[PDB]
Amino acid sequence: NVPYTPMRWAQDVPNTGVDKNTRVMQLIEAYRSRGHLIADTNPLSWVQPGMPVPDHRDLDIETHNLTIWDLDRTFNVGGFGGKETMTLREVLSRLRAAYTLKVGSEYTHILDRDERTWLQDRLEAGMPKPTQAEQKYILQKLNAAEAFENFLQTKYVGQKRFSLEGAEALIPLMDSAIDTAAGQGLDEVVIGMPHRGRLNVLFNIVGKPLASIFNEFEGQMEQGQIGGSGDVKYHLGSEGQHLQMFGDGEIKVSLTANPSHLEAVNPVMEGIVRAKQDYLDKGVDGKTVVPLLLHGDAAFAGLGIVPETINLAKLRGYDVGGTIHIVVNNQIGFTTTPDSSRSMHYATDYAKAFGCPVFHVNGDDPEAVVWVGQLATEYRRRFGKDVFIDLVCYRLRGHNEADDPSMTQPKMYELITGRETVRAQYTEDLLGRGDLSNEDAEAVVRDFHDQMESVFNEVKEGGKKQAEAQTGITGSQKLPHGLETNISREELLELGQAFANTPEGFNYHPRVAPVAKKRVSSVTEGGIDWAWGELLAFGSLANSGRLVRLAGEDSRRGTFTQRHAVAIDPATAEEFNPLHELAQSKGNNGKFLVYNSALTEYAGMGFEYGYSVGNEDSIVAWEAQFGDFANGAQTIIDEYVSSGEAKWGQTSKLILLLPHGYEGQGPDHSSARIERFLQLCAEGSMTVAQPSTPANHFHLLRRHALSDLKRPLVIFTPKSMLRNKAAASAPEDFTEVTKFQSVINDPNVADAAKVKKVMLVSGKLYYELAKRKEKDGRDDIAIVRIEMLHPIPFNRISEALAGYPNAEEVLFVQDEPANQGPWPFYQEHLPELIPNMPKMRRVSRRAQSSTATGVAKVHQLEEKQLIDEAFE
Amino acid sequence: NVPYTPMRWAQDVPNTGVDKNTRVMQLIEAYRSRGHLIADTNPLSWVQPGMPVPDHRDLDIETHNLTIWDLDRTFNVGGFGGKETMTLREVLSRLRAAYTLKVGSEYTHILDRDERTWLQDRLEAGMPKPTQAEQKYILQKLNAAEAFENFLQTKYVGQKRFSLEGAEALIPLMDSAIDTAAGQGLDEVVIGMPHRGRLNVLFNIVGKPLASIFNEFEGQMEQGQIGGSGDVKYHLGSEGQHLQMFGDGEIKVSLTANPSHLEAVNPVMEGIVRAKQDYLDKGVDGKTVVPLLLHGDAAFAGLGIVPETINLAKLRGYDVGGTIHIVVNNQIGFTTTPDSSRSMHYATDYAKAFGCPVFHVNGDDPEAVVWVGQLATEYRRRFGKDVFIDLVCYRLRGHNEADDPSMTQPKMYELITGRETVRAQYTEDLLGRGDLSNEDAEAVVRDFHDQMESVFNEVKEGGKKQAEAQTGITGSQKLPHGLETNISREELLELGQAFANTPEGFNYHPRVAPVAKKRVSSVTEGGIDWAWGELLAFGSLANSGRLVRLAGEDSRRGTFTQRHAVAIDPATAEEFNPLHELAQSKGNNGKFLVYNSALTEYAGMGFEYGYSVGNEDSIVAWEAQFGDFANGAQTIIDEYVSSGEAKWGQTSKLILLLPHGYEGQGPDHSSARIERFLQLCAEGSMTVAQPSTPANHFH
Ligand SMILES: CC(=O)SCCNC(=O)CCNC(=O)[C@H](O)C(C)(C)COP(=O)(O)OP(=O)(O)OC[C@H]1O[C@@H](n2cnc3c(N)ncnc32)[C@H](O)[C@@H]1OP(=O)(O)O
Ligand SMILES: CC(=O)SCCNC(=O)CCNC(=O)[C@H](O)C(C)(C)COP(=O)(O)OP(=O)(O)OC[C@H]1O[C@@H](n2cnc3c(N)ncnc32)[C@H](O)[C@@H]1OP(=O)(O)O
Ligand SMILES: Cc1ncc(C[n+]2csc(CCOP(=O)(O)OP(=O)(O)O)c2C)c(N)n1
Ligand SMILES: Cc1ncc(C[n+]2csc(CCOP(=O)(O)OP(=O)(O)O)c2C)c(N)n1
Ligand SMILES: [Mg+2]
Ligand SMILES: [Mg+2]
């Protein structure tokens, strides 16, 4: 069982042509680059039959025209191993010791020389010999990891736990990284991980009490929110403190909640870290919250959200000073082997794309594992980049605890079955070297077992409560009754003046200057448009001292060139953020941060959700370019935004700004899928609104921000109505009007007694209907707007309908197809909420399997048809 | 305007310590590995302010302890440039010519030496000098690309087209690759691409008639399905023939339909290619349908479906002999610059993960572009692996034709605005070298313009039909009235006996043997369970002569250990597929193929959808591990499966097997979201069923 290729008999070669000194230094570069290909990183003597074996002839001396006869000859190695001259024998020994033992490194791909040299020096120096106390501490962690898994197997044989057996070295690895971070003087470590060994991590790393874990297996689950639905045991988060064993350092450890959907936590945990770092506010030299992200090998290679999130690592609005990635490479998925799982040689090969170091470490060598954890954490601190650890291990049992893996992988599990564990191996190693005594070895096992038995007994003696019906989370949070969202005239005037207070040598772009000038004058004269109404909300909130973050694709300028949150001087390319400067001058340390996201909805929205969780006091808005593309981030909407509170008691105030409107731009530039958002809405999960005026949008945003209702807000924003003069708001609507209006009654009714027909509408379609009403002089029609879709303001709608006693019929008018828009929601619910209301008649486009027509001229035809149908 | 670093004044260094021969060969490896970092691949003199500039000191001779005084000294280069000895001056010249001109190569990361040597030899040999006929042909393609874009700008000023202006070299690149494939004797090229320059590709590459394109701008759209809703002009597919200009080769070219959702076509087009290759049935030496996949730089880096699909390249049930990837690197998204778009140095850096060559080529050097296209196609044929071309270009106008990019990128568009086009540059180059004459240059421009004017006039003289209401696709296809789906007793007994007809030295796993024994006896005694009922359906269909493909996570065994489509001998690890063997013995060339998918729903289901489109006669079933995870492939369900027929007239018979049932396994192992599937269902778009008996599922 020698891993290297034997020396080959050959005749000595003359030192002609390429010099042997050249050949030697080529050999050195070969090992530094490709030495990992033959490194002893695999605990099993296993090669996957269908996996292409890479060529590694570059590591043989024959390839470099060197022979056994050169071994004792001296060569100039140019400072290799801190020596100018060396024998080939010594060169080979040093190369093999550094690159072909338990740690396989990929770093030569790194372009920065200082980075490469830093890694090179440390890898070639080797792992320092640990102290006996350190060795004993590693054994304790290994023991705890294995004993915990074995205890659950004994007490709960027929319960799914996703054991860490075969990968117990993860616990000392994580502990090593966290301990190193504590010694660096950092503030917190945020962990995101999958199912694999989650309970083990919760107990041994985070420090969740053992009683809680045992209660979960018994059936008693800890409730997050009052009347919450809950979730399985291996989807929950926790918080704890980590104290340095051999130091005075202390660091906070947090584990984030995640769904069963693999790798969905990646963008969320990054956002949490960023929000935490921003709160600490230690500047560019800070970044004192460490993201520690765990992955499975199949998921890391398979799913695309992984590289998508890594892509955010160095972006201005997303940088967190690097993420430590640990891939638990157990060399299998559920049943799919790596041959059928990926096309890459290594699971961690995405690191090559991003120019980040990779450490492949053998999961049966705990000391090497601990060293790699320390080295990775030091690299992150020094260079502020992502680092990838490939923990090469195996999965002792099936995917779950009630599955037989021998049916499909008989040969692989012939090697796995019957092996001695890493704990056993390490104990034998320590005893062999005389670094540990026998009675100490038995003490470690006995002490920990007694701890678990005692705790188990206390849980058992407690009474087992029977199953009960779960109510719901409808009234778990309070509505802000009596809250006034208007600002003073002085505040409004000051917000307007922000766009006039340009820096000394700053000039607006000629096509932006009119927009800025209008904003300065609108706060007194009027004609405040949608974009200005939105910025007034965010500006006023930032003035009060809040951190307001707006992110999304093309958000700084706006997709429709409406926002201009940050203006750029054409000449100097100097940026100017008027509202941020105003906020900072008010002395409440308010901030208005606007970022252009990367081309991503999944990672984009996920990051903003995470931000809202990491800092509850921040106002975070994610803007889609079009609402149609939000379905790209369906996992985030389904698993986090909509159901986060009910499953985990995790609340968020995330705002989604989704452009919506049927204007004849095709099936993927028309609808934000209102019907899908309303289908997810239950037990008052989130607020869904489609405001018709800038002022109403202003009030909606402020109500959300100033309330204690910690639930998401989904706003369907307009496209063409951004520049519609009829929609503009007066200044009094921001200062005199105190509250958001969920229902706006018809402002053009001369006599309410004459009204025979009432039209319910939501969004831009009102203005078309209003225009037609004025043109035709229809005094018998009243057009009522519904600004808030969910929850349903049935009291306000009833009140509006009651104001027209002679109303015979009620029409629900929408631009969307019949099987889309708010109709399907309102058709089912509204009749129940208002029994006395007449039978609603739908007026809309026909039901379609698509969103909208591709033909623009058809759109005009259907629009005309739609309005004609409304007016008899 | 000299691109290289000036030679530095320095004193001569003694040949002490590391030998200078060593240093020289280190320099050679430096250029082969990292020479691309300083290659003249960018048409613009532009560096993105927020983008981290990589260190490239390894390419300076000073770093290797060499000086100007070594330039004329001779060193042993060990067969570099087919010579044993060389001066440092000559070494530098050859390295710079091969690695720092218009083509930047990344290949040293490739682990296979034969692959690496093959690429090394061709890159260091250099681009062969093209003939005047070849040069003239490149100009014609450049002219067609630019003139087409300019014509649309003139005739339809206020209409969105997503022009290819600034990236016109894409057309000769694609033509080069397709021409090379025709010369290799291959059967078809399947293209998947985004919006950027789609109309240009449809006309100049696929060969869609120009009248059709002009009609679309007028408002007259070609209807796919009777009463279909349709889609915008730059989402449609087409088919055509490509004839070799300088050869007797001929190849079929197809462009697949796609939604506005970027990179969603990637898994679908791969499935189409695989289905086509399987139909041809030329074995492992075949793979004669080329996937040519185009990407934008922001989308290629940003979206995760991209690496997700590339991950399928070498899998048993998904291998198509390699995909040719072209990334149109115009160095911008909508408004987001690469600094705010990616963290990778290059957009094509995913290739490093998969161990595939990358060619960065300057989009203003047409001859280099054409060479790279040929080299990529040859590499695919030889090694059967993915190859990545980074076409470094720019975007002349805004994202669309009605957007001002100067508001947000003033400095970048100070360089872009006012440039001479690649066509203009190449024409001037050809005239300068005397490879082209003046009257020929004017002929190319005039002849093509006259072609477009004539066609435009014929479209204009035709009557413009008014807008009409679109009915629907409910009755566009007929229901099978009177169809009987029962099989004979003899057929049923034979299907049962398939599990008893084990190979000579084959034995079942002890926990599988009871299942096999029950299947043999159930066909007479009874008690046929769900899994057996399902296999009886697929088996009976394969017997008739159909290609039945079942794919999904853990599908061969089954998530719930129910299927056992392929049995494995514990001892020998020998596989046995009873139903496939039976089908092949019936003499109708039927097949029952069962595959374990990778960990992916998006790419997994997308590939099966593609398979159903590429071969209409095949029976394709995708199985989710649990129905709950199907929402991972929401783009495929929304944009392809549910609405494919109504938008493009593209039909599919894909079967989705989604495990469903409330049994107390938690919120992500209970529901397949039946309510969501029923909400998409309209105008009889798809069949949704929940059978209660195995027989009913069979029928
Ligand atoms: C996400 C949520 O808002 S949780 C909602 C809790 N309730 C439910 O989900 C079920 C019961 N729902 C209901 O009774 C209605 O849907 C309600 C709550 C909207 C009340 O209906 P109406 O009285 O017609 O609506 P109206 O717009 O007048 O709202 C009444 C008050 O609630 C406030 N309110 C209503 N919805 C919200 C909301 N989403 N966020 C904040 N405040 C809200 C209003 O600001 C108003 O305050 P006020 O008393 O100072 O005037
Ligand atoms: C996706 C589609 O199937 S497109 C369906 C076309 N129609 C529509 O979309 C509009 C709605 N129309 C209806 O619902 C029609 O009345 C029906 C026929 C589909 C409803 O079926 P019913 O008459 O209630 O029941 P039944 O299941 O007996 O259907 C009658 C026949 O249609 C066939 N059929 C019904 N649905 C399907 C289907 N999805 N695929 C194939 N055949 C079908 C049945 O096999 C049966 O054939 P038979 O005449 O040989 O007995
Ligand atoms: C997106 C998604 N697809 C499928 C599943 C089902 N699933 C859960 S764990 C698992 C295996 C993944 O293997 P790997 O990532 O290697 O992790 P391991 O279980 O080996 O630690 C699968 C398919 C899931 N939860 N999420
Ligand atoms: C998934 C998705 N997100 C967002 C969009 C909106 N969008 C359309 S084109 C575009 C820019 C794409 O940039 P790049 O990939 O570089 O292509 P280019 O337009 O520059 O050719 C964006 C974000 C989309 N169509 N699909
Ligand atoms: Mg795994
Ligand atoms: Mg681009």
Q: Is A827 in contact with A821 (CB distance < 8 Å)?
A: no
B/e letters for B354-383, b = 16+ CB within 10 Å, e = fewer, are bbbbbbbbbbbbbbbbbbbbbbbbbbbbeb
> Is the Cβ–Cβ distance between B242 and B250 less than 8 Å?
yes
- Sheet with B619-623: list strands edge to edge: B591-596, B547-552, B619-623, B655-657
- Are B196 and B182 contacting, i.e. CB atoms less than 8 angstroms apart? no
Backbone angles phi, psi at A570, to 5 degrees: -55, -40
CB distance A373 to A176 below 8 Å: yes
Burial class (CB in 10 A: 0-12, 13-18, 19+), A25: buried
Please work out, in degrees rounded to the nearest 5, the angle formed at the alpha carbon of residue B73 by the alpha carbons of B71 and B77: 95
Give the pairing of strands B324-329 and B289-296. parallel
Cβ–Cβ gap A411/B26 under 8 Å: no
Whether B309 contacts B272, CB under 8 Å: no
Complete DSSP assignment for A388-442: EEEEE---SS-SSTT--TTTT-TTHHHHHTTPPPHHHHHHHHHHHHTSS-HHHHH
Rounded to the nearest 10 degrees, what angle do helices B489-497 and B513-525 cross at? 170
Number of helices (H), then strands (E), belonging to chain A: the values are 29, 24
CA distance A856 to chain B (A): 8
Nearest Cα residue to A358 out of A106, A171, A605: A106
Dist CA A579 CA B673 (whole Å): 44
How close B356 gets to chain A, by Cα (Å)? 10
Taking CA atoms, A499 is separated from A519, A538, A569, A810, in Å, by 7, 14, 14, 45
Distance CA A765, CA A865 (A): 13
Counting runs of H as helices and runs of E as strands, what totals does chain B give?
24, 16
CA-based nearest residue to B61, from B13, B87, B24: B24
Closest partner residue to B573 among A410, A668, A676, by Cβ? A410
B140 close to B430: Cβ distance less than 8 angstroms:
no
Q: Is A170 in the pocket of ligand 3 (CB under 6 A)?
A: no
Q: Is A572 on the interface with B (CB under 8 A)?
A: no
Q: Are strands B238-243 and B188-192 parallel, antiparallel or unpaired?
A: unpaired
Q: Is A703 in the pocket of ligand 3 (CB under 6 A)?
A: no
Do B553 and A302 make contact, defined as CB atoms within 8 angstroms? no
Residue type, A118: W
Query: Mapping DSSP to helix (H, G, I), strand (E, B) and coil, where does residue B144 land?
Result: helix
Is A116 annotated to bind a ligand? Reply is no
- Contacts with B235 from chain A: Cβ below 8 Å: 854
Tokens of A361: 């470490």
CA–CA separation, B353 and B335 (whole Å) = 28
Instruction: Name the strands in the sheet holding B238-243, side by side, starting at the edge strand that comes first in the sequence.
Output: B103-106, B358-362, B387-392, B324-329, B289-296, B188-192, B250-255, B238-243
Angle at A646 between CA A645 and CA A651, to 5 degrees: 5
Q: Which residues of B184-202 are buried (b: 16+ CB within 10 A; e: fewer)?
A: bebbbbbbbbbbbbbbbbb
Tally of CA atoms within 13 A in the half-sphere of A85 that contains its CB: 6
B561 touches chain A (CB under 8 A): yes
Estimate the crossing angle of helix A530-544 against helix A694-706, to 10 degrees: 30
Helix (H) or strand (E) holding B250: strand B250-255
Q: Which amino acid is at B17?
A: G
User: Å resolution of this model?
Assistant: 2.1
Q: Give the end-to-end CA distance of chain A in Å, rounded to a whole number.
A: 89
Q: Which residues contact B426 (CB under 8 A, 6 or more apart)?
A: B138, B139, B142, B366
User: What is d(CA B23, CA B28) in angstroms, rounded to the nearest whole number?
Assistant: 9
In chain A, the residue whose alpha carbon lies closest to the alpha carbon of B34 is A111
> Peptide bond before A791: cis, by omega within 30 degrees of 0?
yes
- Ligand 2 center to B480 CA (angstroms): 9
Instruction: Give CA angle at A294 (A291, A296), nearest 5°.
Output: 155
**Which residue's entry shows tokens 């049930």?**
B317
d(CA B164, CA B146): 8
Neighbours of ion ligand 5 (CB under 5 A): A 296-298, 330
Pairing relationship of beta strands A238-243 and A250-255 according to DSSP bridges: antiparallel
CA angle in degrees (0–180, nearest 5) for B694-B695-B699: 120
Q: Which of B235, B410, B557 sits opposite A335 (nearest CB)?
A: B557
Distance CA A574, CA A412 (A): 61
State the residue for tokens 């319960």: A159
Across the interface, of A341, A406, A638, the residue whose CB is closest to B599 is A341
Residue in A339, A632, A635 closest to B261 by CB: A632
Please check whether residue B513 touches A, CB under 8 A.
Answer: no
- Find the helix or strand (DSSP H, E) in which A101 lies: none
Which helix H or strand E contains A119, and what residues bound it? Answer: helix A113-125
Q: Which atom of ligand 2 sits closest to the CA of residue B479?
A: 42
CB atoms within 10 A of CB B241: 11
Pairing of β B74-76 and β B85-87: antiparallel
Annotation-wise, does A785 bind a ligand? no
Which ligand gives the minimal distance to the CA of A629? 4
Q: What angle do CA A579, A721, A714 make, to 5 degrees?
A: 65
Pick from B354, B404, B682: CB nearest A819: B682
Are B604 and B638 spatial neighbours (Cβ–Cβ below 8 Å)? no
Query: Residue A809's beta-bridge partner residues?
Result: A757
Rounded-to-integer distance, Cα B204 and Cα B141, Å: 8
Angle of helix B20-34 versus helix A20-34 axis, rounded to 10? 30
Degrees, nearest 5: CA angle A753-A756-A760: 110
Instruction: Please state whether A750 falls in left (phi above 0), alpha (psi between -120 and 50) or beta.
Output: alpha
B262 lines ligand 4 (CB under 6 A): yes
DSSP E strand boundaries for A16-61 = none
Cα–Cα distance for residue pair A475/A286, rounded to 1 Å: 41
DSSP letters spanning A784-810:
EEE-EEES--HHHHHHHHHT-TT--EE
**B137's tokens:** 């042909």
Q: Is B695 exposed, middle or buried (0-12, 13-18, 19+ CB in 10 A)?
A: middle
What B122-127 contacts at long range (C-beta under 8 Å, 24+ apart), as own/partner pairs, is B122/B375, B123/B98, B123/B99, B124/B81, B124/B94, B124/B98, B126/B97, B126/B98, B127/B103, B127/B367, B127/B368, B127/B371
β partners of residue B295: B327
SS3 A100: coil
B345 DSSP assignment = S
Q: Which atom belonging to ligand 4 lies closest to the Cα atom of B333?
A: 13
Q: Is A112 part of the contact surface with chain B (CB cutoff 8 Å)?
A: yes
Interface check for B29 against chain A (CB to CB < 8 A): the answer is: yes
- Cα separation, A360 vs B349, in Å, equals 21
Bridge partner list, B192 = B293
Cα–Cα distance between A306 and A299 in angstroms, integer? Answer: 8
Best of A600, A625, A626, A634 for a ligand 4 pocket test (most atoms within 8 Å of beta carbon)? A625
Experimental technique behind these coordinates = cryo-EM
Nearest to A606 by CA among A571, A558, A631, A641: A641
Q: What separation in angstroms does the CA of B188 have from each of B185, B241, B369, B382? A: 10, 9, 22, 17
The answer to whether residue B333 neighbours chain A at the CB level (below 8 Å) is yes
Q: How many CB atoms lie within 10 A of CB A447?
A: 11
Please state, in angstroms and rounded to a whole number, the distance separating the CA atoms of residues A374 and A130. Answer: 12
Does residue B623 belong to the interface with chain A, where contact is any CB pair within 8 Å?
Answer: no
Q: How many Cβ contacts (< 8 angstroms) between chains A and B?
A: 359
Which residue do the tokens 């044989």 mark? A157
Cα–Cα distances in Å, from B629 out to A305, A400, A629, B94, B679?
Answer: 15, 18, 20, 54, 18
B678 CB near a chain A CB, below 8 Å? no
How many whole angstroms separate alpha carbon B121 and alpha carbon B123?
A: 6
Task: Sort out which chain A residues have CB atoms less than 8 A from B465's CB and list them.
Answer: none
What kind and span of H or E run contains A357?
none
The DSSP symbol for A190 reads: E
**C-beta of A822 in contact with ligand 1 (< 6 A):** no
Q: Could you give the 3-state DSSP secondary structure of residue A304?
A: coil
CB contact, 8 Å: A849 with chain B? yes
Residue type, A782: A
Rounded to whole angstroms, the Cα distance separating B592 from B171 reads: 41
Going from the C-alpha of A496 to that of each of A532, A704, B221, the distances in angstroms are 9, 23, 48
Residue B223 three-state SS: coil
User: Across chain B, which distance is largest between two alpha carbons, in Å?
Assistant: 96
Cβ(A855) to ligand 4 under 6 A?
Answer: no
Which residues have any ligand 2 atom within 6 Å of their CB? Answer: B 474, 479-482, 684, 686-687
Cα A798 to Cα A701: distance, rounded to the nearest angstrom: 25
**Residue in B211, B226, B674, B97 with CA at minimum distance from that of residue B458:** B211
Please provide residue A54's backbone torsions phi and psi, each rounded to the nearest 5 degrees.
-65, 155
Q: Is B354 in the pocket of ligand 3 (CB under 6 A)?
A: no
Query: Which tokens go with A455?
Result: 């705790």
Asked if residue B392 lies in contact with residue A550, where contact means CB atoms within 8 angstroms, the answer is: no
Closest Cα to residue A554, out of B335, B104, B138?
A: B335
Is the Cβ–Cβ distance between A422 and A168 less than 8 Å? yes
The 8-class DSSP code of residue A202 comes to I
Cβ–Cβ < 8 Å for A791, A688: no
Check if the beta carbon of residue B591 is closer than 8 Å to that of residue B508.
no
- The residues pairing with B656 across neighbouring beta strands, listed in sequence order, are B622
Determine which helix (DSSP H) or strand (DSSP E) holds A537, and give its type and residue range: helix A530-544
Tell me the CA end-to-end span of chain B in Å, nearest whole number: 75
